Design a protein around this ligand. Sequence first.
Ligand SMILES: CCCOc1ccc(S(N)(=O)=O)cc1
Ligand SMILES: OC[C@H]1O[C@@H](O)[C@H](O)[C@@H](O)[C@@H]1O
Ligand SMILES: [Zn+2]
Length: 257
Amino acid sequence: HWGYGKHNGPEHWHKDFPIAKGERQSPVDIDTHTAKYDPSLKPLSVSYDQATSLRILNNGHAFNVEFDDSQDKAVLKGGPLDGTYRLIQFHFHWGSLDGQGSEHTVDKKKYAAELHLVHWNTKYGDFGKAVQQPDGLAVLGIFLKVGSAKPGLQKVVDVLDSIKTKGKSADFTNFDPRGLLPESLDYWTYPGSLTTPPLLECVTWIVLKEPISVSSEQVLKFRKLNFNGEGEPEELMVDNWRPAQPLKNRQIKASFK
Ligand SMILES: CCCOc1ccc(S(N)(=O)=O)cc1
Ligand SMILES: OC[C@H]1O[C@@H](O)[C@H](O)[C@@H](O)[C@@H]1O
Ligand SMILES: [Zn+2]
């Protein structure tokens, strides 16, 4: 099964998923000097006031906080996006050490972790049909650095002990993802892919420039999760990030001058 180890990690994924070597793979390094301000980007709208979280799941590669996406509640609009994109789940990627863990990099800098808020384009009806489309998904990516604690993250941290191993889930209602956002919505955007198999090239990436700060204690609790299932030998869930992929025939646009 695909994973992050030596025998099944990112450098092996192309055998089962040949699109791994495709023309619009993610993540990428964001070269800040080459990214160009784009005055055609409309204001970005993150409208999470009515979000309904449901559950948190350890899927063996990360943990997902899942949302009720059965109507227009938590949505992303504006910026590079045509139309309305509905929040379905968020998850993180993180390292074994604070010096690595992000998937995107900024002038080759690796952050300690990266949050992905995953949204699907409502014109396609369901997530499954959206991932058959070149503009099916929008992922809002937010870097994490280690410093002061993020209060809005603590409820996530505290439930992780109950989903330690692959296949475990827990109720996770009334979680407000607004508490995971930095002050500024300045961003970079480019067309890319899912960063895990099946690596589908359906994503408009929107990567915020301002990281959030989380405490060492918070990220240390991420690193206590397990990739393995209950009763199997413990393999800590760390370094669940794909490295930067070739930019190829793409441009990264900036929302800010
Ligand atoms: C098609 C089912 C998998 O869905 C996702 C896989 C990876 C991401 S990421 N890491 O690019 O945000 C999002 C959805
Ligand atoms: O041909 C000129 C155009 O080249 C494109 O690659 C850039 O994205 C545009 O911003 C520029 O105006
Ligand atoms: Zn992700």
